[PDB]
């Protein structure tokens, strides 16, 4: 029963609130609590008792309670800072403690970054075990829109494609996996694969070939 | 630091003990919680209870299912987790919880993944993704393991026992249309440094209780 944007969005060094919505019987009434989850880690405490930072946390982040509307303030942003943030207290209606939606803090103008793109083929017991997986890693690109197709003697191959959601890594550049599931048999058949990954316009094209 | 362990696969109606050990405080003189996170979803409070006696608070999701308790030596806080449903897929953390003035966590645990789910566990098959002088040589020599195959999640990998962490990046997981996951952890290293460094990638499945440290070698 707490309510917060889903998103929050603004440049470094500018001031961003996250508003948690609630009513008289939780924000209005009770203390409130901030949390901020990096991605991959488990949710730290940020604030408590409404106003109180906790340890490590630096006075750019502020809590405030302005009627039944609990505030997160955070001046001069830095891109260290993009997390999901959480609102916390105690409901009356209920007999249990709540948590607000959560708001996931993007910060803008972070410079765009090329992926950086490595296709492994089949290691050696993979194929004594009657397996092929190609494995294509990509890594510390801005933003995270990248799309990964698999070539076959640059013919288009759909079949035994998995593909990651691109994900935030801890320097805030984001990372994708693509992986081509093959026999043995498919993969020393063709003359070589290759996996082009698209991003922001331009693609990045590696190849791996059975006979190195 | 909190650490919580018992996470893995069960399956509809069926029931799992977790656990978390404190290496520091004590659990009995402490008000304790459990808080659940469902994949894509946000924070959830399951059950607290406090030092004095086994009477324990439970979220109106998990009332009568579920039952907190600790063993009174050895800081240990366990939670019962029966009759379990698809929704109760989540990360569970143990926390201590302030109820002062203001009811807050203020330490966390790391986690462990609850998956509710008809299927079966199934252990990593971890292959070595060998350096090469070409598609895995950007100016510096990159290398990995491949994870394939496993149920449910998670995986961890460090490398040469966590003495290694700089140039690694252990990517997200993936469900192949299988209903089986594939994730990889690569390394970037001088290309200088190959021959000689011995690198040993450290893969973690707390799930099927398997861990594989796999030699990656110079093909």
């Known amino acids: 029963e707490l309510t917060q944007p889903p998103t929050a969005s603004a440049a470094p060094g500018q001031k961003v609130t996250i508003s948690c919505s609630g009513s008289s019987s939780n924000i209005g009434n009770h203390y409130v609590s901030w949390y901020q989850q990096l991605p991959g880690t488990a949710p730290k405490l940020l604030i408590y008792?409404?106003?109180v930072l906790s340890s490590g946390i630096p006075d750019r982040f502020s809590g405030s309670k302005s009627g039944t509307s609990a505030t997160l303030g955070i001046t001069g942003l830095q891109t260290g800072d993009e997390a999901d943030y959480y609102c916390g207290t105690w409901d009356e209606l209920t007999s249990n403690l709540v948590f607000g939606g959560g708001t996931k803090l993007t910060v803008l103008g972070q410079p765009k970054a090329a992926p950086s793109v490595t296709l492994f083929p089949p290691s050696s017991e993979e194929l004594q075990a009657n397996k092929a997986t190609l494995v294509c890693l990509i890594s510390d690109f801005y933003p995270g829109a990248v799309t990964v197709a698999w070539k076959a003697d640059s013919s288009p191959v759909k079949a035994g494609v998995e593909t990651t959601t691109p994900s935030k890594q801890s320097n805030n550049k984001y990372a994708a996996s693509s992986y081509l599931s093959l026999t043995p048999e498919q993969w020393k058949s063709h003359r070589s694969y290759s996996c082009q990954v698209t991003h922001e316009g331009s693609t990045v094209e590696k190849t791996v070939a059975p006979t190195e | 630091q909190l650490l919580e362990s018992g996470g893995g696969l069960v399956q509809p109606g069926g029931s799992l003990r977790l656990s978390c050990a404190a290496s520091?405080?004590?659990?009995?003189?402490?008000?304790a919680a459990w808080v659940r996170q469902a994949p894509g979803k946000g924070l959830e409070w399951v059950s607290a209870?406090?030092?004095?006696?086994?009477?324990?608070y439970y979220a109106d999701s998990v009332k009568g299912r579920f039952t907190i308790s600790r063993d009174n030596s050895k800081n240990t806080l366990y939670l019962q987790m029966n009759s379990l449903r698809a929704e109760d897929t989540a990360v569970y953390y143990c926390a201590r919880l302030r109820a002062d003035l203001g009811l807050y966590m203020d330490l966390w645990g790391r986690g462990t993944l609850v998956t509710v789910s008809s299927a079966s566990t199934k252990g990593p098959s971890v292959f070595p993704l060998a350096p090469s002088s070409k598609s895995t040589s950007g100016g510096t020599a990159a290398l990995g393991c491949l994870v394939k195959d496993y149920f449910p999640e998670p995986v961890t990998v460090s490398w040469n026992s966590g003495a290694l962490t700089s140039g690694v990046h252990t990517f997200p997981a993936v469900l192949q249309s299988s209903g089986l996951y594939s994730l990889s952890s690569v390394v970037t290293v001088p290309s200088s440094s190959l021959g000689t460094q011995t690198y040993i990638c450290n893969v973690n499945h707390k799930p099927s209780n398997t861990k594989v440290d796999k030699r990656v070698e110079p093909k």
């Open positions: 008792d409404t106003t």
């Open positions: 520091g405080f004590t659990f009995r003189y402490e008000v």
């Open positions: 209870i406090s030092g004095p006696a086994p009477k324990g």
